[PDB]
Design a binder for these strands. Structure first.
Ligand SMILES: Nc1nc2c(ncn2[C@H]2C[C@H](O)[C@@H](COP(=O)(O)OP(=O)(O)OP(=O)(O)O)O2)c(=O)[nH]1
Ligand SMILES: [Mn+2]
Ligand SMILES: [Mn+2]
Ligand SMILES: [Mn+2]
Length: 430
DNA sequence: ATTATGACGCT
DNA sequence: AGCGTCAT
């Protein structure tokens, strides 16, 4: 009743750039704009692997994780842009630099948590309080929410999509109590006004479009963001959760799309998020552990407490390359040459990071995969990272991995290596 | 040959 | 510390 917490304390947004790498290439090359187009890494094997897809191309069935030759079968007019290659490997610097452009704009409105190269969470609770005091109690005009959907509306008592969006927004605004500065629905609405302003600034100052979700926590904001892409934002209220979750497959909620979610489905014999409400907290903890059980008990009621961490910069700076099939590394000279290539890219990125961000990494993580192992990483070992020098880092990585060569010959490497990975970690202020 | 990154939990 | 999971 009056003591039952409802998880409505915060206003949280999730901003995700639409088909980011594609947009970066479309800004650079206007010939690619408003076209079916995709971004690929490499080219010789099956035309390269697609990693990002414009919405025009998605309409033909093109998807990430598809070979370009196969995508061209679905979409013969598909346009392609290739990721830059430096030192023999894909180099993602252009997209990291574009990401910094967007993150710095978002940080003007509120403190952000960089969740990926193209998405960030935003804690808007305080900004919403401020804008509400600036409002002095006037309602919010629909004109302030020109790209916002209200999930679950319209309802009850109409042929076009924009008209649907506007009907739902009108129903939502008509039911707002704008006199209560602590109304969670009002707070979410003001949050959506601010996110309209943030997205407008991003597009004005970079050319890039994005989608966003606004709700009371990170999981609901992420889920909301996906409901109406591209170039739109969605408000998911606390009240919208029972209907939304009643037909939501469990795998759609962030962290449940893998083995844990499959086990929730199998053990409990359910399909949808809302079905979780029928279990006690102790029942869920008994199946899925104390932490997961409490998280699921609260999540299926729309409640989640994970904070938006104040972190705009990545915690790690890494370099990795797969060597699939017959390109696996089988000699010592090969392994050394590629460790050097990775370490040279790492040195360049670390030196730029030190100048930009006033910090130094102190630990080097070396990971490899050996032929025949299904796991991503066959081995991870750390060593000290005391100087930003590529030859030193590559010799140190070789030292930590050389015991993995089971060949009796000094020159050959067996079993051959199908992955190398160098990662700089444990940053200290400098 | 579903690649190149990231974050975070477990023990 | 080293390994696994999840995202995409
Ligand atoms: N190198 C590499 N980059 C990836 C991979 N998967 C995604 N990316 C990059 C390219 C995407 O443009 C970018 C952001 O990913 P998202 O999942 O948010 O998708 P994207 O922004 O492409 O489309 P969206 O409109 O958000 O559905 O991350 C991958 O497997 N390898
Ligand atoms: Mn995106
Ligand atoms: Mn995507
Ligand atoms: Mn994203």
């Amino acid at each position: 009743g009056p003591h039952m917490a409802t998880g409505q304390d915060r206003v949280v947004a999730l901003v995700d750039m639409d088909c980011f790498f594609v947009q970066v290439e479309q800004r650079q090359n206007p010939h690619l704009r408003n076209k079916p187009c995709a971004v690929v890494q490499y080219k010789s094997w099956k035309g390269g692997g697609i990693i990002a897809v414009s919405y025009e191309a998605r309409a033909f069935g093109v998807t990430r994780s598809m070979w370009a030759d196969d995508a061209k079968k679905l979409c013969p007019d598909l346009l392609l842009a290739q990721v830059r290659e430096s030192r023999g490997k894909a180099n993602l610097t252009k997209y990291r630099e574009a990401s910094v452009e967007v993150m710095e704009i978002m940080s003007r409105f509120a403190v952000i948590e960089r969740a990926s190269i193209d998405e960030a969470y935003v804690d808007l609770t305080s900004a919403v309080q401020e804008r509400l005091q600036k409002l002095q109690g006037q309602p919010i005009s629909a004109d302030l929410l020109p790209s916002t959907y209200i999930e679950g509306l319209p309802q009850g008592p109409t042929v076009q999509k924009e008209g649907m969006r506007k009907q739902g927004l009108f129903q939502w605004l008509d039911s707002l109590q704008i006199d209560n500065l602590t109304s969670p629905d009002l707070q979410l609405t003001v949050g959506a006004v601010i996110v309209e302003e943030m997205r407008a600034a991003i597009e004005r100052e970079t050319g890039f479009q994005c989608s966003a979700g606004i709700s009371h926590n990170k999981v609901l904001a992420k889920l909301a963001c996906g409901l109406n892409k591209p170039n739109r934002q969605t408000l998911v209220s606390h009240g919208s959760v029972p209907q939304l979750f009643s037909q939501m497959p469990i795998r759609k909620i962030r962290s449940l799309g893998g083995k844990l979610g499959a086990s929730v489905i199998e053990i409990l014999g359910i399909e949808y998020m809302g079905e979780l409400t029928q279990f006690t907290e102790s029942q869920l903890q008994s199946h899925f552990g104390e932490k997961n059980g409490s998280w699921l008990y609260a999540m299926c009621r729309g409640i989640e407490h994970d904070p938006v961490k104040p972190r705009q910069l990545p915690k790690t700076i890494g370099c990795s390359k797969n060597f699939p099939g017959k390109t696996a590394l089988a000699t010592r000279e090969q392994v050394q040459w590629w460790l050097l290539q990775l370490a040279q890219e790492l040195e360049e990125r670390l030196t730029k990071d030190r100048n930009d961000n006033d910090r130094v990494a102190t630990q080097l993580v070396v990971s490899i995969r050996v032929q025949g192992d299904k796991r991503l990483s066959s081995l991870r070992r750390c060593c000290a990272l005391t100087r930003y020098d590529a030859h030193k880092m590559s010799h140190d990585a070789f030292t930590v991995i050389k015991n993995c060569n089971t060949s009796g010959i000094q020159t050959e490497w067996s079993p051959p290596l199908t992955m190398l990975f160098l990662c700089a970690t444990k940053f200290s202020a400098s």
